[PDB]
Design a binder for this molecule. Structure first.
Ligand code: F91
Length: 330
C-alpha cells in the first residue's frame, strides 16, 4: 500500500505545516502537524478542557464506531519550546492520504498548554520519530508509520515541504518526479529516538565549503535551523547589522537586508537553502528588525535540521531494518 497527502503551511511564514488526517468511523478529519521529532499522535478532542480549546477541530471518540478506550493508558509530552499536552488514549482507524491503519493509538488531549490553544490551525500532532519516544504509559504505543510499515510497498516516507506553498508527505514510495538529480543517503542513529544524522559541513552564500561533521536531527516539527554557535555566527556575520538579541531570543537582522544562502552537506552532496528561506519577518508587527531562520543550538543540546533546511530538499525517511535518511535537491 501507499499514501499521499498534501501538507500546507499554517501561515505566511511557514511556521508549521498541517496535513489532513482521517480518524474514526465515520471519518473525522483533523489537520495535524506531522512531526519527525516526536512519536505521539495526539489530538484535540471532546475531552479537552473547554477553556483550552479555541477554534480547533476536535476528535469525538463517542461519535466513532471503531473507537475503543485503551484502558488505563495515559500520555504526557513536552516539546523543546516548552509546550505540552496530556490525556488518555483510544485506538481507532486512522488514514493518511488513502493509507489506512487500524488499531492506531489516538492520544486524546485532556490538557494542552497555551501555545496549542492559541494556534487554531493545528488540531494535534502526528509523530514520525521512532516509537521508543512514544509517551504512552504503561504500555508504549507505535507511531502511524511503524504500524503501517509492513503494509507499505517500501518501508519509507518522504517529506517534500514547500516554501510559502503546499508540499507533500508520501508513504511507501519515492516519487521520482518530485526531485532533481539523485538522492544522497546518509546514516542514521536511532539511539536518541530521532532521525539523527551527521552533516558533512556548510557554506555561507558563495563562500567556500567548510568540511566539518555536524550531528543533528531531521525535524519537520521544528520551524528553524538550529546549528552550533560557530556556524551561526559565521552566517550572520555576512549580513550587515545582524546581531544576537537576548531580548528577542536569537539573531535578528535589518528587514532591509538581502540574506545570503546557506549550504549544508549530505555526504558529498550539497543542499542549498536560498536566503529568502531564512527570513522570518518582523519581530513584531511594523518592526524593521526581522527574525532569522538560522539560530544557535547552544543550550538546546542538539542541532536541529528543521523546516528551514528540510523544505530546501526532498527528504526520504527510510525505515528499513537499518534506517537511513536521503536528501535530494528539487
Ligand atoms: C513539536 C511540537 C511543537 C509544539 N509547539 C508548536 C507547534 C507549532 C507551532 C508552534 C509551536 O509555534 C509556531 C507555530 O507553529 C514544537 C516542536 N515540535
Amino acid at each position: 500500500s501507499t499514501g499521499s497527502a498534501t501538507t500546507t503551511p499554517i501561515d505566511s511564514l511557514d511556521d508549521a505545516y498541517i496535513t489532513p488526517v482521517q480518524i474514526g468511523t465515520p471519518a473525522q478529519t483533523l489537520n495535524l502537524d506531522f512531526d519527525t521529532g516526536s512519536s505521539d499522535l495526539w489530538v484535540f478532542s471532546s475531552e479537552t478542557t473547554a477553556s483550552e480549546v479555541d477554534g480547533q477541530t476536535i476528535y469525538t471518540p463517542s461519535k466513532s464506531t471503531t473507537a475503543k478506550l485503551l484502558s488505563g493508558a495515559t500520555w504526557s509530552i513536552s516539546y523543546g519550546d516548552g509546550s505540552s499536552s496530556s490525556g488518555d488514549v483510544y485506538t481507532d482507524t486512522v488514514s493518511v492520504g488513502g493509507l489506512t491503519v487500524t488499531g492506531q493509538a489516538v492520544e486524546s488531549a485532556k490538557k494542552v498548554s497555551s501555545s496549542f490553544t492559541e494556534d487554531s490551525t493545528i488540531d494535534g500532532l502526528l509523530g514520525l520519530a521512532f516509537s521508543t519516544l512514544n509517551t504512552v504509559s504503561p504500555t508504549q504505543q507505535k507511531t502511524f508509520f511503524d504500524n503501517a510499515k509492513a503494509s507499505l510497498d517500501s518501508p519509507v516516507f518522504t517529506a517534500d515541504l514547500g516554501y510559502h506553498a503546499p508540499g507533500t508527505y508520501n508513504f511507501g514510495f519515492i516519487d521520482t518526479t518530485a526531485y532533481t538529480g539523485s538522492i544522497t543517503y546518509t546514516a542514521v542513529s536511532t539511539k536518541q529516538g530521532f532521525w539523527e544524522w551527521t552533516s558533512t559541513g556548510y557554506a555561507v552564500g558563495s563562500g567556500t565549503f567548510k568540511s566539518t561533521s555536524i550531528d543533528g536531527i531531521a525535524d519537520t516539527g521544528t520551524t528553524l535551523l538550529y546549528l552550533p554557535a560557530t556556524v551561526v555566527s559565521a552566517y550572520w556575520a555576512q549580513v550587515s547589522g545582524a546581531k544576537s538579541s537576548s531580548s528577542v531570543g536569537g539573531y535578528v537582522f535589518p528587514c532591509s537586508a538581502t540574506l545570503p544562502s546557506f549550504t549544508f552537506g549530505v555526504g558529498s552532496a550539497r543542499i542549498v537553502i536560498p536566503g529568502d528561506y531564512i527570513d522570518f519577518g518582523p519581530i513584531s508587527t511594523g518592526s524593521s528588525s526581522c527574525f532569522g531562520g538560522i539560530q544557535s543550538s547552544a543550550g538546546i543540546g542538539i542541532n536541529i535540521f528543521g523546516d528551514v533546511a528540510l523544505k530546501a530538499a526532498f527528504v526520504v525517511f527510510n525505515g528499513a531494518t537499518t534506517p537511513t535518511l536521503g536528501f535530494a535537491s528539487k
